Design an enzyme around this catalytic site. Structure first.
Site, mmCIF file in Angstrom:
data_model
loop_
_atom_site.group_PDB
_atom_site.id
_atom_site.type_symbol
_atom_site.label_atom_id
_atom_site.label_comp_id
_atom_site.label_asym_id
_atom_site.label_seq_id
_atom_site.Cartn_x
_atom_site.Cartn_y
_atom_site.Cartn_z
ATOM 1 N N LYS A 129 0.962 -1.116 -0.054
ATOM 2 C CA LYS A 129 -0.234 0.137 -0.034
ATOM 3 C C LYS A 129 0.780 1.238 0.077
ATOM 4 C CE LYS A 129 0.779 2.100 4.044
ATOM 5 N NZ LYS A 129 2.207 2.223 3.860
ATOM 6 N N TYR A 217 -4.773 4.696 6.279
ATOM 7 C CA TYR A 217 -5.348 3.513 7.366
ATOM 8 C C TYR A 217 -6.812 4.117 7.725
ATOM 9 C CZ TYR A 217 -0.703 1.433 7.499
ATOM 10 O OH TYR A 217 0.513 0.461 7.220
HETATM 11 N N1 LIG Z 1 1.270 -1.570 5.191
HETATM 12 C C1 LIG Z 1 2.159 -1.325 5.997
HETATM 13 O O1 LIG Z 1 2.166 -1.397 7.379
HETATM 14 C C2 LIG Z 1 3.385 -0.588 5.235
HETATM 15 C C3 LIG Z 1 3.712 -0.656 3.964
HETATM 16 N N2 LIG Z 1 4.865 0.076 3.439
HETATM 17 C C4 LIG Z 1 5.029 0.181 2.202
HETATM 18 O O2 LIG Z 1 6.055 -0.403 1.476
HETATM 19 C C5 LIG Z 1 6.718 0.102 0.504
HETATM 20 C C6 LIG Z 1 8.256 0.139 0.641
HETATM 21 O O3 LIG Z 1 8.595 1.243 1.501
HETATM 22 P P1 LIG Z 1 9.629 1.192 2.878
HETATM 23 O O4 LIG Z 1 10.185 -0.163 2.792
HETATM 24 O O5 LIG Z 1 8.949 2.031 3.997
HETATM 25 O O6 LIG Z 1 10.772 2.029 2.382
HETATM 26 P P2 LIG Z 1 12.310 1.882 1.889
HETATM 27 O O7 LIG Z 1 12.869 3.135 1.401
HETATM 28 O O8 LIG Z 1 12.863 1.145 3.169
HETATM 29 O O9 LIG Z 1 12.592 0.596 0.757
HETATM 30 C C7 LIG Z 1 12.276 0.775 -0.525
HETATM 31 C C8 LIG Z 1 12.801 -0.456 -1.220
HETATM 32 O O10 LIG Z 1 12.402 -0.553 -2.561
HETATM 33 C C9 LIG Z 1 13.448 -0.591 -3.520
HETATM 34 N N3 LIG Z 1 13.545 0.386 -4.173
HETATM 35 C C10 LIG Z 1 13.766 0.389 -5.636
HETATM 36 N N4 LIG Z 1 13.854 1.675 -6.272
HETATM 37 C C11 LIG Z 1 14.096 2.441 -5.244
HETATM 38 C C12 LIG Z 1 13.733 3.816 -5.122
HETATM 39 N N5 LIG Z 1 14.005 4.560 -6.466
HETATM 40 N N6 LIG Z 1 14.003 4.517 -3.897
HETATM 41 C C13 LIG Z 1 13.790 3.814 -2.837
HETATM 42 N N7 LIG Z 1 13.818 2.572 -2.889
HETATM 43 C C14 LIG Z 1 13.845 1.751 -4.065
HETATM 44 C C15 LIG Z 1 14.732 -0.758 -2.604
HETATM 45 O O11 LIG Z 1 15.279 -2.181 -2.607
HETATM 46 P P3 LIG Z 1 16.767 -2.774 -2.416
HETATM 47 O O12 LIG Z 1 17.607 -1.685 -1.623
HETATM 48 O O13 LIG Z 1 16.903 -3.917 -1.780
HETATM 49 O O14 LIG Z 1 17.427 -2.871 -3.870
HETATM 50 C C16 LIG Z 1 14.256 -0.524 -0.995
HETATM 51 O O15 LIG Z 1 14.716 -1.508 -0.125
HETATM 52 C C17 LIG Z 1 5.969 1.435 0.227
HETATM 53 O O16 LIG Z 1 4.881 1.109 -0.707
HETATM 54 C C18 LIG Z 1 5.241 1.491 1.742
HETATM 55 O O17 LIG Z 1 4.030 2.422 1.307
HETATM 56 C C19 LIG Z 1 5.786 0.569 4.482
HETATM 57 C C20 LIG Z 1 5.633 0.538 6.002
HETATM 58 C C21 LIG Z 1 4.411 -0.232 6.254
#
Ligand SMILES: NC(=O)C1=CN([C@@H]2O[C@H](COP(=O)(O)OP(=O)(O)OC[C@H]3O[C@@H](n4cnc5c(N)ncnc54)[C@H](OP(=O)(O)O)[C@@H]3O)[C@@H](O)[C@H]2O)C=CC1
Ligand SMILES: NC(=O)C1=CN([C@@H]2O[C@H](COP(=O)(O)OP(=O)(O)OC[C@H]3O[C@@H](n4cnc5c(N)ncnc54)[C@H](OP(=O)(O)O)[C@@H]3O)[C@@H](O)[C@H]2O)C=CC1
Ligand SMILES: NC(=O)C1=CN([C@@H]2O[C@H](COP(=O)(O)OP(=O)(O)OC[C@H]3O[C@@H](n4cnc5c(N)ncnc54)[C@H](OP(=O)(O)O)[C@@H]3O)[C@@H](O)[C@H]2O)C=CC1
Ligand SMILES: NC(=O)C1=CN([C@@H]2O[C@H](COP(=O)(O)OP(=O)(O)OC[C@H]3O[C@@H](n4cnc5c(N)ncnc54)[C@H](OP(=O)(O)O)[C@@H]3O)[C@@H](O)[C@H]2O)C=CC1
Lengths: 381, 381, 381, 381
Positions: A129, A217
């Site tokens: 999401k 949420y």
């Molecule tokens: N449902 C819930 O409770 C939650 C949902 N989320 C969702 O999870 C998703 C990921 O966000 P989140 O984990 O918090 O954020 P992060 O910034 O920590 O991670 C994003 C991940 O996506 C990849 N990625 C690819 N392109 C990009 C880019 N251009 N910029 C940044 N990251 C990129 C990377 O993978 P790698 O580095 O390994 O190559 C990175 O680990 C979002 O859509 C967020 O809304 C987040 C928190 C809670």
């Protein structure tokens, strides 16, 4: 006065015993393999560590852009190194039959992309999401799923959290009476130095501010708690113009909605105020307070009436239900197997995005935005 | 070891002893005499019963239009039968030196009239909220107050409630950090069969719907919790069109505000949902949750941060502060005796009325209303 | 739609209206007149202040050994200066028809004497707990009560406290199942500099230590919560030997009991730890937690089962039942007017004293003490 | 007004990102292998499923008497089938270098046995509570550990539960003041039909009733909360003679203890009353309430003072500490590696058993049992 047969019939010596009573989810099979995209905060803090508790899910392969890291992770969770894909050859996963689906956990802007790509890779799609940064992009994701005749499931964990479900049930059993006023609030201080919070500040990757991230949420909540869709919405937003964090995305925004039932709601999200996850549903018999409402752990609910407050929370020695994360993972594996539709279909993620865009519009124009487009929730909320 | 002087010196026979330790407010005098106008629900359930805990106030006369009722209440409170006044001979109180002030507990639309008549009668005035049904009327009360050189105080019991003052205190000590979001809800099911609710459904007597009656709590609360005034308001209101209760006054109304400091707020009042009195003040350091927030009894407050919930409420064996009702009654009395201003002057009452008109106006036009009109809280919040 | 008859019929001009809805106990009469013996800490902080909420009781006379103090309290409560009595001319109350009863709030060792003198003076008697310092003395009070054909009631405020009665009610409705374990604790730091605590450290005046003063709450509570009497008691007591506070009376004492039903209990009282009033009643279906259990205000109760905690406490806008102090005062009054027995007769007071002696005896001998002596709670717990 | 460097520097396209912030325990190495004996209730419901969350622990081999089951389990947790030992060849584990230690989770009577056997198998011993059914047997276990120059650690998970630790810390920081009265209660209905509850009814395997099983929590608790050992103890027990469940072991038992500090405690355990885990520590500044006190999940603590209740509990989005189970497992792996002494040494498990036997004796003789034998806690509580 004599001891029970079972008792007296126990070898005062080392002996084999039967399967003990299960006072919590026991591991069963592991016939569903997941392809996890983006090794970010959520992926490594709440998702991966939540697979262990699954009953039918396993981490078959990773998909990271960073190699050094990706390899390390692969170890911790014991995944075949030869299966550490990346954004370049993410498509090759279609050449592996042990990859039943992918779980995209990338920035919102990249959601739609890897979803469709994944669908053509003949795999099921579990996208996080918000579904995507574009209403249209949401639609393309669906179409891809239908073309590839696969399942599309957004990552709405609250749809699989025990307390949230208990919340919906008590409301369905009419414990609050006729519903008339919902109040939601979702907040947490935005940390610009946090790698995960940076793309969220960028309107291009995020697609919006707090609302797109956490206000969703309360929006989603209001919807499954009431068990109906908003027909109208109004909203106002504001951010301190001096705060560098909200140059592009919004810090705080407040939205009011009306439902066909006649019920009203007012909620808000924020990036400048600390941890807040509180839902309130008012009926004419009682009021429900969910606080914590949508946390990872320790959720708590209370039904209040003059002189009374009946609270519910996870028991202290048993687990009659699995945690939202594992439950979510196995929810796809389970919809695939018994061939059943998921409760969090792309159609659901889409609805939220429209409403959010409808909200932003209301906040932008300062006029009400009609949302009576006739969406229908498949499989109830 | 041996016994201390205190104990060893206690006679074993019947003997007079010292004044005891005070663990609750003790009575002192009954110098300030009130004339209660309007023997209704609030008067007979809260105010009259409230004179017992006063340290400086007493009931000297009653003003009712129901003689049968006056004689009964009069006898119940030891009031002199000769001191019963009806609405037409009300002005003759000017002849009674033992009457220092009046407490107007009449329907909203009648407050102004009697406050003014009371001032011409040369008496101090305690008047319930809403102050009046028109901004202009609030001014005539203030002007009349200035002409008689007597004091005018609006009945804001929350300005003398231990927990509310405590919530204000922890906020001013920056335990929440920079304040950003304030949420408020005030609801109670309107029952038209209750004599007191009947005039509340008449626009001409009430001045308005749930905002005028109980929304004012969230409004006023928002103002003294932030310690600042709103610069603009936006709002929407809706009432089932087939509900006979809301033909003339509004049932549910939602309003959000922005303050010069940047903080925002969103609250609601309701006549169709059950008991609700809840305030939350989000800071970037902590969150304050007042629930119940404005009850007659049992108010409770909580300062929350991840992993904690520090709660405060009245002690179980000691009464550090007097109850809001008694305090409010003695506040006017003290301010007259010591020649000091009141914390809840007509200006304050007038500010709420002005804000309420802006909210209705904003609800009506569906547009924002600038309220940045330079009101200054004299003496602090 | 249109407005209901009620509202549409409300005059827009000043007009008498109906009696209002009562949401709290209203005053009714002041038929029953008391004579308060002993203007101490409990009298001036709780009882006197408690006459205001009474529906049938009033203060007619005072009995003190400190004239300076009597005249002050007398003036504070509008009592006739002629109605002040000292300890030597106490008996002359027999001459005042307007004095129906006395409320003895003197040190424990002096209760018997004045109860008896009051009975010979032909008056009803309300006497604080502990009833007296000797079992025998309790009987002389009872015998004297029977000789004057007047009523004798011990001051067990908890027998008229909404939450305690509610805890009893849910138990008798078997919401906890078969009761098996009851825990009680009652503690408050003894400060010898307080005038009221001075005689409490004198064995001759107090009758005992923390058990006599506050342990009695856990004891009495245990009895009316189970609805049965203990058949045997065991106990141990310890007090720092160098603490001047406990030269003659005990500080901390622990006692456990067994009841004819099989249920057990273990409680403690303490003069060296801070405020504690807590009861838990474990059943095989649920657990009741009363905390605060016996406070003057804010009592709270909770029924717990894995995953739940249903709480009860006084409402925030309505007062279903009168406070324990006012109730207790009116209870004697009503029982005299309607010729009924009191829920807290001297027999009940005597049963606590007898049990307390057994506990001390058990502490002293370090042996069990059979208390299966056939006491029968007349009228129920 | 410009966006932060970090933000603006993010590829609006698929890019590799750094290691995300850790808001919860991240998996590290897995260099410690465990040999789990007895695949019972605790082993399969709380222990095995708790390995996944470890940072240095892994399940290398199982030891079950039941083959069909043992094989199934081995699958779920992915253990080399060729490594499914049994009670016959449990000793062969000494022929595997990948078995760093064993975790005995068998009935109390079989504890001492497999411990010593294990020690000669050149492996570390993690034995569950209670240590053993004999004081002497506890000693033999120690001796074996010293002979084999290995580490002996009992399974006291509360020694590794965040809230329990926070409890000890606040008490060490003197937040309650001088400690004087502790109250504990541990209860849960005994189910004779539960395979795991049968050997508990058998005095031979169990070694005692509730006290040996769950009352040990309050006993142990009282000890680390106070931070000292009891010097004296008294106790009484009782069971319904008609209940078949307690023919051999006791249902309920209540114990009172005294400490050198002068502090007193009174607690109890039960098999006939439902879920209860509540600790209470009274000081002269504040009282601590732990309820839940020793649950698997949802523990909650509160420090109370007149008018206040400061509560602590696991946060709702973060995990600053690992769960007691994983933390316990990695606690041995961590004591071995850095070559450090464990906080739950056999010396500790022994102390509890002596005290328990001392208690049973007191309950048996009805006299106090001196326990001032000079035990010293190594590494603080
Ligand atoms: N449902 C819930 O409770 C939650 C949902 N989320 C969702 O999870 C998703 C990921 O966000 P989140 O984990 O918090 O954020 P992060 O910034 O920590 O991670 C994003 C991940 O996506 C990849 N990625 C690819 N392109 C990009 C880019 N251009 N910029 C940044 N990251 C990129 C990377 O993978 P790698 O580095 O390994 O190559 C990175 O680990 C979002 O859509 C967020 O809304 C987040 C928190 C809670
Ligand atoms: N601060 C607080 O917490 C609260 C404040 N209030 C305020 O107190 C005031 C009175 O309200 P409340 O006690 O609830 O209401 P009620 O309807 O119960 O009583 C109003 C009283 O005023 C007199 N009155 C004179 N003319 C009229 C008329 N035309 N219609 C109705 N009453 C008339 C009557 O007294 P009599 O019969 O003796 O002539 C009547 O008892 C209001 O301004 C209200 O906003 C109300 C509730 C709470
Ligand atoms: N039910 C409840 O919750 C409580 C009940 N009590 C009970 O009330 C009774 C009075 O205790 P409390 O008010 O706390 O104590 P205080 O010491 O404050 O007062 C005792 C009063 O009795 C009179 N008195 C006569 N002779 C003596 C004497 N020799 N020594 C001391 N006082 C004397 C005095 O009145 P005067 O000066 O006017 O002559 C004095 O004010 C006790 O029996 C106590 O157990 C106490 C607290 C709570
Ligand atoms: N610290 C804590 O929170 C808790 C600690 N425990 C402790 O764990 C230990 C195990 O008890 P628990 O898991 O509840 O009980 P179970 O009855 O469920 O299991 C006992 C296990 O030990 C083995 N065993 C060997 N001989 C016997 C025998 N003669 N009778 C029964 N079992 C035998 C069996 O292994 P297999 O069948 O596979 O051959 C069986 O799985 C106890 O010492 C208990 O006190 C229990 C609960 C909580």
């Amino acid at each position: 006065a004599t001891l029970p047969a079972g008792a007296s019939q126990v070898p005062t010596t080392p002996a084999g015993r039967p399967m003990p009573y299960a006072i919590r989810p026991m591991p069963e099979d592991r016939r569903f393999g997941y392809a996890i995209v983006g090794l970010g905060k959520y992926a490594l803090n709440q998702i991966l560590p939540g697979f262990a508790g699954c009953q039918h899910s396993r981490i078959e392969a990773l998909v990271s852009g960073n190699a050094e890291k990706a390899k390390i992770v692969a170890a911790e969770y014991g995944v075949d190194p030869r299966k550490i894909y990346d954004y370049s050859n993410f498509d090759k996963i279609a050449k592996d039959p042990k990859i039943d689906a992918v779980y995209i956990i990338l920035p919102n802007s990249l959601h739609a992309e890897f979803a469709i790509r994944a669908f053509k890779a003949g795999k099921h799609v579990m996208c996080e999401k918000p579904m995507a940064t574009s209403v249209a992009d949401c639609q393309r994701m669906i179409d891809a799923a239908k073309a590839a005749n696969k399942k599309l499931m957004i990552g709405y964990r609250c749809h699989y959290d025990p307390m949230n479900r208990a919340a919906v049930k008590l409301i369905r059993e009419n414990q609050l009476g006729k519903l008339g006023m919902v109040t939601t609030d979702n907040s947490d201080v935005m940390d610009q130095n946090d790698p995960a919070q940076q793309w969220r500040l960028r309107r291009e990757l995020a697609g919006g501010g707090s609302l797109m991230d956490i206000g969703i949420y309360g929006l989603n909540g209001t919807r499954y708690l009431l068990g109906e869709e908003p027909i109208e919405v109004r909203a106002y937003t504001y951010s301190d113009p001096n705060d560098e964090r909200f140059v592009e995305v919004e810090d705080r925004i407040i939205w009011q909605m009306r439902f066909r039932s006649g019920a009203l709601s007012h909620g808000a999200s924020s990036y400048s105020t600390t941890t807040t996850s509180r839902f309130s549903v008012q009926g004419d018999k009682a009021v429900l307070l969910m606080d914590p409402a949508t946390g990872y752990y320790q959720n708590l609910i209370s039904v209040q009436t003059p002189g009374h407050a009946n609270q519910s929370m996870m028991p202290q020695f048993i687990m009659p239900a699995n945690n939202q994360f594992s439950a979510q993972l196995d929810h796809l594996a389970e919809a695939v197997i018994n061939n059943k539709p998921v409760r969090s279909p792309g159609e659901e993620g889409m609805q939220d995005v429209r409403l959010i865009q409808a909200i932003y519009e209301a906040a932008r124009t300062g006029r009400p935005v009609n949302t009576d487009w006739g969406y229908v929730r498949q499989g109830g909320y």
